[PDB]
Amino acid sequence: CAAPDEHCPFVASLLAQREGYGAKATGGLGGKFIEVTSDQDAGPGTLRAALAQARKGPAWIRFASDMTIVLKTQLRVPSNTTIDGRGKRVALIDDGLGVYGAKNVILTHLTIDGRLTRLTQAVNVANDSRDVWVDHMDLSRMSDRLLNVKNGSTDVTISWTKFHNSNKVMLLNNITSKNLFQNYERDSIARVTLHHNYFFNTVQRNPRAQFGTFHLFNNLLENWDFYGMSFSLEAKALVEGNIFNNDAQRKCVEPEFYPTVEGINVNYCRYIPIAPARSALDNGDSDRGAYEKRKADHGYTRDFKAFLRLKDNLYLGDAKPVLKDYRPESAPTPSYCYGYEKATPELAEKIRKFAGNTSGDTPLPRTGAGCPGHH
């Protein structure tokens, strides 16, 4: 490991774990190592300085020591870059990572905690970004968003990541026009795989997904305060082997208030007793009102609902099923090979143990249509 090539064992070990729509990402493979030696927001040896250097050519960024990096603005991640916090405890505080117009990016083993300090995002994959792998992250306390994949971005895998202690967690595409399908051609190309993630002590949008093609398998949603998942507007999703666990009688752990653009907002603690039955919003409910009000003038021929195929999802504790198959024939049958596990309480335990920015290893356990010899 003089360089991040296929012969470097920790490069090879990481790349062996790839699966899903982001599985082609190699980040800084074949480029240079850059070792972050300063924990400052900016300056020599900083993460920000490393990312600037990474604009010049493929870079695999590692950290010299455990560090807390208090960010004043969001970091911008260029193409062909890996940010690799393995072997160290690295936390980004108050701001996060923007992946804008970038191809071929791997983010692994980092903590990002917004502390509700400012209106920003932990991981923002936007504006024609592609081939992005978000792995073993620990993301929390963003007053805007933990993670977006939006605005013509595609070919993304989110794996083994702990999303916690935050309100509006994840958007898979957004809506920025009154005509709900105005950006459909642009955003329907989004292909995103979510597997082995842990959504714990969050409020909502776990994820909220529209327009694109999504595969959610073997995720654990636990102790949400408002709703778990939401799908609408011809999202096409295969939702399989996930575990939803909740209890209507538990102590609230939300902050007293949330900062917002319009000022201070109350928390969602009063919804705890009705949250378990809202494992998801009903299919299409996120945008149904707008769709029904606007369909007269816009003449929508696309569905307000998502096309869903659901298999082998658990509903534990007080959690109750909501989502059912709807036009399942139009949901994806992913072209790739993936390591699907039967949904059991033992799987939930595995996810709680290993999801996030953890020290233990998560090698792939694989059959399916995309698996040569093992269909």
Ligand X SMILES: CC(=O)N[C@@H]1[C@@H](OC(C)=O)[C@@H](O[C@H]2O[C@H](C(=O)O)[C@H](O[C@H]3O[C@H](C(=O)O)[C@H](O)[C@H](O)[C@H]3NC(C)=O)[C@H](OC(C)=O)[C@H]2NC(C)=O)[C@@H](C(=O)O)O[C@@H]1O
**Residue 286 interacts with ligand X (CB under 6 A)?**
yes
From 242-250, 281-289, 295-303, 354-362, span contacting ligand X (CB under 6 A): 281-289
Asked if 17 touches ligand X (CB under 6 A), the answer is no
Residue 133 or 163: which CB sits closer to ligand X?
163
Q: How far is the CB of 343 from ligand X (least distance, A)?
A: 25
CB-count exposure of residue 359 (10 Å: 0-12, 13-18, 19+): exposed
Closest chain position to ligand X (CB):
286
Q: Which residues ranging from 252 to 271 are in contact with ligand X (CB under 6 A)? A: 265, 271
Per CB under 6 A, which of residues 191..230 are in contact with ligand X? 208, 230
Q: How far apart are CA 68 and CA 167, in angstroms?
A: 23
Q: What is the DSSP letter of 282?
A: P
Per-position DSSP letters for 165-234, written without gaps between them: EEEE-EEES---SSSTTTTHHHHTT-EEEEES-EEEEEEE-TTEEESSEEEEES-EEES-SS-SBEEETT
Question: Hey, what are 217's tokens?
Answer: 């398998």
In terms of CB distance, is 63 or 268 closer to ligand X? 268
Minimum CB–partner distance for residue 289 and ligand X (Å): 5
Q: Is 118 a catalytic residue?
A: no
Site size toward ligand X, by CB under 6 A: 7
Q: Which of residues 289-318 bind ligand X (CB under 6 A)?
A: 289
Out of 130, 205, 208, 309, pick the active-site residue: 205
Based on C-alpha coordinates, what's the Rg of the chain?
20
CB 281 to ligand X: min, Å:
6
The yes or no reply on residue 143 touching ligand X (CB under 6 A) is no
User: In whole angstroms, what is the distance from residue 133 CA to residue 155 CA?
Assistant: 9
**Residue number, 271 or 300, with CB nearest to ligand X:** 271
Q: DSSP characters for 22-58? A: TTT--TTTTSEEEEE---SSSSTT-HHHHHHHHTTS-
The residues after which the chain has a C–N gap greater than 2.5 Å are 365
Judged by the rule CB under 6 A, the positions of this chain that interact with ligand X are 208, 230, 265, 271, 281, 286, 289
Catalytic residue list: 205
